[PDB]
Amino acid sequence: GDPKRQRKKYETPSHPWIKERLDRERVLKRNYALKNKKELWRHETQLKEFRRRARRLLAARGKQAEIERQQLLQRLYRLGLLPADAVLDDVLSLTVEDVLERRLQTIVYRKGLARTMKQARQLIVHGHIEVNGQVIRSPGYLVLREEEDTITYAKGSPFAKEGHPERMVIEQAK
Amino acid sequence: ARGIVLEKIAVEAKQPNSAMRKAVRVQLIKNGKVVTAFTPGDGAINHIDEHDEVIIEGIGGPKGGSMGDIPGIRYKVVKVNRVSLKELVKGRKEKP
Amino acid sequence: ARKGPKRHLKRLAAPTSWYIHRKAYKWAVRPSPGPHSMKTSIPLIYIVRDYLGYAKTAREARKILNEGKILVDGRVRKDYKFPVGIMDVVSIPETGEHYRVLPNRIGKLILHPISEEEAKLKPFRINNKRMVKGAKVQLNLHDGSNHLVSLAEKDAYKTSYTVIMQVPERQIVKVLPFEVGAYVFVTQGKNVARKGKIVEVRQFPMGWPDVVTIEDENGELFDTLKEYAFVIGKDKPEISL
Amino acid sequence: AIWQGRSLKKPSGGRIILARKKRKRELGREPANTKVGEDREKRKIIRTYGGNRKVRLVEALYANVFEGGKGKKVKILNVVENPANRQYARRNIITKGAIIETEIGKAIVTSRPGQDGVVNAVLIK
RNA sequence: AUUCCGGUUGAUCCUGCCGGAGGCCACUGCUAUGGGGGUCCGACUAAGCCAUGCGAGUCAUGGGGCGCGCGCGCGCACCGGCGGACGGCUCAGUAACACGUCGGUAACCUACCCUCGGGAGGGGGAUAACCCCGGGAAACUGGGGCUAAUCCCCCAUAGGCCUGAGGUACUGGAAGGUCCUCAGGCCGAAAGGGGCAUGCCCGCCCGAGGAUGGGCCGGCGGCCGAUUAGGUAGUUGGUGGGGUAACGGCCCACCAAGCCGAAGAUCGGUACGGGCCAUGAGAGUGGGAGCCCGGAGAUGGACACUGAGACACGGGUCCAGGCCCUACGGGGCGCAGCAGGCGCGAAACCUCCGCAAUGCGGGCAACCGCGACGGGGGGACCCCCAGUGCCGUGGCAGCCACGGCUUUUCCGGAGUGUAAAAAGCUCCGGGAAUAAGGGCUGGGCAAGGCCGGUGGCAGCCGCCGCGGUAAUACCGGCGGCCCGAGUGGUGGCCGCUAUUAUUGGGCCUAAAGCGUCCGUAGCCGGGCCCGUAAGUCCCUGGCGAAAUCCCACGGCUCAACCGUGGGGCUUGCUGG
RNA sequence: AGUGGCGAAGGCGCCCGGCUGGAACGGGUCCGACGGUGAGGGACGAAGGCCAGGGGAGCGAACCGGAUUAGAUACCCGGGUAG
RNA sequence: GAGCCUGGGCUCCGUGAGGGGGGAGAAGUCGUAACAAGGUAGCCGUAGGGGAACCUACGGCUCGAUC
RNA sequence: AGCCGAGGGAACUCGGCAAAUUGGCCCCGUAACUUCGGGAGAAGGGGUGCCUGCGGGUGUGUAACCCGCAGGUCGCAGUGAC
RNA sequence: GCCCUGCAGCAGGGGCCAAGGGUGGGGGUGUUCACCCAUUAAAGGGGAACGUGAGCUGGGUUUAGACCGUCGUGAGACAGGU
């Protein structure tokens, strides 16, 4: 026999040089300030996994089937991609932009803690951003629904003072 | 695979092309069998000499075989005395 | 090639009846031969260290064991390899703690806390019978232990009955037979840890074991084997489950 | 050495290639040809697999003859009519199933002396 | 993503093959900042050869004795006891009851362990250490004297085994079994020792059973070859015996003529078997070094001793073939153990620290030992998360000038961490500074109709095809596109391929109907009625180790990873 | 004499007589699924060729001659062996 | 029951005077057999003959043109 | 006209002339090639005495002729010479 | 045993005296000679009725038998072979 080897968590396209895919991925990379295509591809893989689980469970009879259905719906509600009164057909209308909106970089931008996505990435990586209580340095953390309101500046950080030059330059936008 | 050079030669290109392709006969060290290998690059034959050890790859072709307009040759030179031909031909390294 | 018996055991190869981490290390304590089987027992050091948490290493456990601070069936046990099994009693008199060993509906062994009164009784299942010299009857029980009885009272002991005994001194009290209204506790199989009353027995030809049907107090019926049906009471239990 | 472990041919008639050595468990021993004695009796002792004991008779003088529950210890004269090999009657070699003469009469051996150390026989009617 | 694109013609539609474009494994060129986790690293050729050091010991509470200090305490060796048959390495051989699964032993063995029931009576002996004298180059080894034991021997009693005649108490589905009585016989136990103390701890022998571990048997299941067609002669069975722990042609004596085979025997080739893995929408194709379970081997081959267990990797004997020491008389060795070396090759690491954790052996215990195990060192082994700056103003088309900010990373330090360290984590000081390349640029296929050189030479090229004086296709320069701490080259497998087609291909003309008929096995088979219930269907009991796979929750910053639980996998077997 | 007919196919044309195989039509006749295809095996199978024996008109491979041709081991002409 | 020797069977490899045909390769010699009725319509089978493509005879096919 | 000859073994000679080797019976096993009848006793190998016994075939047969096996023992040698 | 040298030594070349001793074994061929091998101090050439058949052998050659090739109408021949 042959033993186990750890496998990738992202997929690559079938052809590397198709104009439409290139254009779309270019636009997304630019507008969400990503470093590579690996990140885009692994978010897309998350989506595809959700979508395959739904396709499988749909019309499957038993008990484990309904258990897994409810598990999936609750997981999505917790991540923040679906409301509570949702159904198994609302999954197939999801897109990748939602998975892209559920990451720290984007949330830190949409919340007014940073002027740009690159600035938000720098903050996260240098350790100025806090979650409920913690310091996380991974701009692809996939923030949950109960934490989106506990995101602030860290106690030990110059930005945590209201009179910091750069924090004033940031508040000058709003 | 690895072998030792015995003879430097030139082969005719097939029709409707006109050119000489530079090659060498190589006597392998595993089994002693003699084969022929093409020297790629502009001037790669001058960075070679008899009794030099050289490493041999496949040339790249249909069914692990002859490629393009030089049939009869299945192999290709990669390294000369433990240095690479690409570097020797670009001018970045030297043959000891 | 192997020239003899085994003396080690790896953690990925340990039985499923154990609560153990299999990837943390490579080696596990191989039990020594003893009363119960390997698929039905767990050593003592795992109890002292991983279940109750009175020690973090094995030196400490050996040290408490070599001082008589732990009993099993009213007896002192100093061997960290001794196998503990079902219906057995673990007693710490320095902490006033008494536990009874039983399985789950999953098949794993646990510790059910009991009282000092019920800690002095242990049920046994008669597994076979023999006639030995002096014309005496020897009952072979389910933990591999044995009891002697006279010929005059041979018809009262059969091969599936249950016997309650004071544990250290090993004196009998309150035999319990195998009938069509007796209480039961399943010990192995798919329906392990269930409980109910007997309804029907069934026999088969040429080597295949006998089957028994049982009814739980919710009213549902289920079958299993007759050697897996431990008898613990007539209408209600005598021990705590 | 007496292997006594396995056959090197299949019933179809094909050949077999031993994939391993000859183990020690599989081995056997050479036979005791229990003879009628002249002066004494001879017994060997043998250690065995699990640390156990076997007793071999080599020479015999006395037999235990039974007639309906009553046993007598008598002597062994010429051996007669061993139905297992022609030469055994001549060599006066005793086996199970052999017919022997005693001071009383003819008797059949019901024991295995190479395994037990005694010759027990039943008298003929 | 259940996918297509280029190539036979002056142009067209087909068949059919070659190539591209995706993924995984091994070698390799250029280039390279930092962490974490993990079942990664002399497997492919040579199961080829090995210099040095380590890889298996422990008990002083079994016994006598020597030395050092105050009968006591410390230490050394000797006799004695248990262990060394596990663990660790490798894939040569093996097409086999070797492996997997279901069953069986009413045909068998088992030291360490548990329960119960019973015993420890009476005598004897030697011999190591110690002292005298030694021999031999060594390796090894002789004589004499003195002594002890949980050392050895002997009597007895228990008990063990065989047979014959009876009784029927037990188990079981079923007694060549167990129990009772009688009779005739062979073998034949034990250490009341040691310690504390004024009874407790550790122990010795017998029996009945279990557990642990093994031996043997059976049904089912899983490669290729007919340019391999007949093979077998203890071969197939029976009667009687020997031998084994035990059944058995396992072996022997005698009587017979059977056993396997076209549904492919025998022979030959390759190959450790599975859980698993890679790929694919799936059916399916291919592989089975690393972790687990099983098997086999220790330079080739054969044979034995001791022991519960071996025909014994670090114990023995011989032959063959290799090497070493020698005072030439004689002696010794085989890394497929950890490191290290030579050789072979395209192809694989430090002659490091520790028994603190997990475990094994020994020991009443305290505890000692372990290249197993754990911990670091080297390596583009696999996976996860990041970096090589950000902001604002202005000028251009991502860059530059200017003005400020931050410190992941870098430099230095204090704690914690750790067996000790290191790394990692918390804090402090300095400072944008300490850190992008590789392939491509005619079409397929994303991206230059720009400039200089070469001039059918030199060279490119998976395929089509460029190059013969204005080369978008060579070489270079400047620009541009793909991926990105990685990117390219060679070889192998799956897919592409409905080019192996059960799902799901084709045979007038492109590859392809036997020249035509009759028929054996085999496959396919008309309509109604009654029965059985073998296939098939449903419900349920007992099995198909764990890891691996899917899901949710929780613990390491999230993750990779680990844990709890719920499902599948285990291509299935079996009782109703 | 047919674009025709019989035959499993190969193949079968003067007339009369004898022996023999198979198919179609018609049929309130008989049996009662006895059937299809057929690995391996078998039977038939143009011309030419071989063996053994007979026969031998015409035609005619090989062969020999005359022409034609740059040549002509051929096409055309005259003879001829096997068949 | 090793090793040694001897004979036999199966099987793999290396080599050898001389000869045989196959496949590629700028440009050579002799002919002109196939495509048009290709200048004697072509091709299957059997046999004989010839420097070579090829030619003839017997039986067949049309994948043969003109009337 | 005959018998033996150490160590070597055709170096003798036109030439292995002359001499020597093998040799009966039972069992095992036997090639190329072939006109499928042969080759073929191919080749190559093992065994073989005396004594004490046990069995089988035909037969009425402790008349007669034949066929298999065990054990014991002696010798340099068992178709012991021919 | 000596003399000359285009004789350093080891050797070679050329010549004088000397006939006491030695000058062998094998391969193909009927051979003599000639050729070849391995050794050796070297492996000389000739005469004696081409020494030696009232000493041997008997391969070759020159009878009587037969085969092939050439020559000849033929009978037959060949200083041609077997």
Side-chain angles (χ1 to χ4, degrees), chain A residues 1-9 12 14-15 17 19 21 26 35-38 42 48 53 64 71 75 78 115-116 118-119 121-122 125-126 128 134-136 138-140 164 166:
Chain A
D2 292 329
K4 185 217 185 188
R5 271 176 202 158
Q6 283 185 44
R7 305 140 198 97
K8 276 170 169 96
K9 290 296 194 99
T12 78
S14 297
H15 208 298
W17 304 313
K19 212 164 292 211
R21 211 166 297 258
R26 216 179 273 131
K35 181 179 188 289
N36 283 331
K37 295 280 184 97
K38 303 188 189 190
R42 75 190 205 220
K48 285 189 282 202
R53 293 170 55 183
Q64 209 54 39
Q71 288 180 346
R75 180 70 183 157
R78 190 184 195 191
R115 261 189 83 92
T116 77
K118 302 204 261 152
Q119 187 186 40
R121 198 184 182 102
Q122 214 212 24
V125 164
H126 285 199
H128 302 301
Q134 190 58 247
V135 163
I136 299 190
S138 311
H164 196 265
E166 188 71 29

Side-chain angles (χ1 to χ4, degrees), chain D residues 1 4-7 9-15 17 19-25 27-32 43 45 47-56 64 66 68-73 83-86 95-97 110-112 114-118 120 122:
Chain D
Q4 190 173 356
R6 184 175 175 148
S7 190
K9 252 194 183 163
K10 292 188 264 176
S12 78
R15 218 174 57 88
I17 318 169
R20 52 143 151 89
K21 304 158 172 165
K22 306 174 168 177
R23 301 305 191 209
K24 197 196 186 142
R25 308 181 298 255
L27 290 180
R29 278 172 212 118
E30 67 278 9
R43 269 161 190 100
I45 283 147
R47 175 177 264 176
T48 60
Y49 187 41
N52 316 119
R53 192 174 274 259
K54 258 173 218 201
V55 193
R56 292 275 161 92
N64 307 304
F66 297 93
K70 310 185 306 311
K72 291 183 74 174
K73 183 169 137 181
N85 180 325
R86 308 188 180 287
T95 48
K96 187 203 169 191
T110 58
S111 71
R112 314 179 71 209
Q115 299 284 320
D116 306 347
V118 305
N120 295 322
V122 163

Side-chain angles (χ1 to χ4, degrees), chain D residues 82-89 91:
Chain D
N82 202 318
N85 180 325
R86 308 188 180 287
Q87 317 298 344
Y88 282 1
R91 295 199 255 156

